[PDB]
Amino acid sequence: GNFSQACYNSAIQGSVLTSTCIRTNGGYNTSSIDLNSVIENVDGSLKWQGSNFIETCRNTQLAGSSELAAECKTRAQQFVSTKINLDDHIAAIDGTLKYEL
Amino acid sequence: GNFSQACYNSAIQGSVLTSTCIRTNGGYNTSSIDLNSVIENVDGSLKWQGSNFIETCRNTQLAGSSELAAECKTRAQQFVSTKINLDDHIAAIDGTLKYELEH
Ligand SMILES: OC[C@H]1O[C@H](O[C@H]2[C@@H](O)[C@H](O)[C@@H](CO)O[C@@H]2O)[C@@H](O)[C@@H](O)[C@@H]1O
Ligand SMILES: OC[C@H]1O[C@H](O[C@H]2[C@@H](O)[C@H](O)[C@@H](CO)O[C@H]2O)[C@@H](O)[C@@H](O)[C@@H]1O
C-alpha cells in the first residue's frame, strides 16, 4: 500500500479517492480509484475484504494524508463515526492508484 | 471530464454508466463506472461532491449523450425530475471511464 508516500494533493469525494502521483519518468499522473469496491461497512465500522460501504455511510472525508473517515449505520440502523487507513492497501504504481493484497 | 467526445453506445442502468470509448492509440474499450460513488441527492437535485443518490432516486436514464436523468425525493419526500451532466467529471482515459477532478 502506502500510496500517500508516492502521491500528494489527495482528496476524497463520495467513495472516490483522487491523487497526484509520481511517475518513474519524472512526471506525475492524476489518478482516481473507487474505494467502494474494497471497503465494507461492517456494523458501523469500515473494514477491508468487502464492498458497498457507500450505501450505508455518509459524510466521507480524508483526514491527514491517508485516513478515510465516515459516519456509518450499524445493523440496528444507528450512526457511528468510523475510520480506516487507506495506506493499508492502496498503492501507487507508476502514477496509478491500485488496490493491493 | 468530457467522455462523450470519445465514446459511443453509452447506457445507464440503475447507478451504472457503461460506454465504449476510443483508446488513445486506436480501437475501442468498454468500461463501466458506478455513479453512486460520486453523485448525491440534495433535496431533489443531483449534485457532485457526495454519494448515494440511488438510495433516494429512481427511474434513472441516459438523456442525449451525457446527461443522467432521474426522479429524486426532496426532503419533503416528493419525487421531482432532476438531471446532471456526466461530462462535468467523467472522462475517457485511454478508453476507460474515470472520475476526474477540476484541474
Ligand atoms: O445494506 C448494504 C450494506 O450491506 C452490508 O452491511 C450490513 C451491515 O454491516 C451494516 O451495518 C448495515 C447497515 O444498514 O447493512 C448491513 O446489514 C455491507 O455490504 C455494507 O458495505 C453495505 O452498505
Ligand atoms: O438517505 C440517503 C440520502 O441522503 C442524502 O439525502 C438527503 C436529502 O438531500 C434527500 O432529499 C432525502 C431524500 O429522502 O434524503 C435526505 O435526508 C444524500 O446523501 C442522498 O444522496 C442519499 O440518497
From Swiss-Prot, chain A:
<feature type="disulfide bond">
    <location>
        <begin position="7"/>
        <end position="21"/>
    </location>
</feature>
<comment type="subunit">
    <text>In solution exists as a metastable domain-swapped homodimer which very slowly converts into a more stable monomeric form at room temperature. Under physiological conditions it is unlikely that the dimeric species exists and indeed the monomer is more active against HIV. Interacts with HIV-1 gp120.</text>
</comment>
<comment type="similarity">
    <text>Belongs to the cyanovirin-N family.</text>
</comment>
<protein>
    <recommendedName>
        <fullName>Cyanovirin-N</fullName>
    </recommendedName>
</protein>
<keyword id="KW-0430">Lectin</keyword>
<dbReference type="InterPro" id="IPR036673">
    <property type="entry name" value="Cyanovirin-N_sf"/>
</dbReference>
<dbReference type="InterPro" id="IPR011058">
    <property type="entry name" value="Cyanovirin-N"/>
</dbReference>
<dbReference type="GO" id="GO:0030246">
    <property type="term" value="F:carbohydrate binding"/>
</dbReference>
<dbReference type="GO" id="GO:0050688">
    <property type="term" value="P:regulation of defense response to virus"/>
</dbReference>
<keyword id="KW-1015">Disulfide bond</keyword>
<dbReference type="Pfam" id="PF08881">
    <property type="entry name" value="CVNH"/>
</dbReference>
<keyword id="KW-0930">Antiviral protein</keyword>
<feature type="disulfide bond">
    <location>
        <begin position="57"/>
        <end position="72"/>
    </location>
</feature>
<comment type="function">
    <text>Mannose-binding lectin.</text>
</comment>
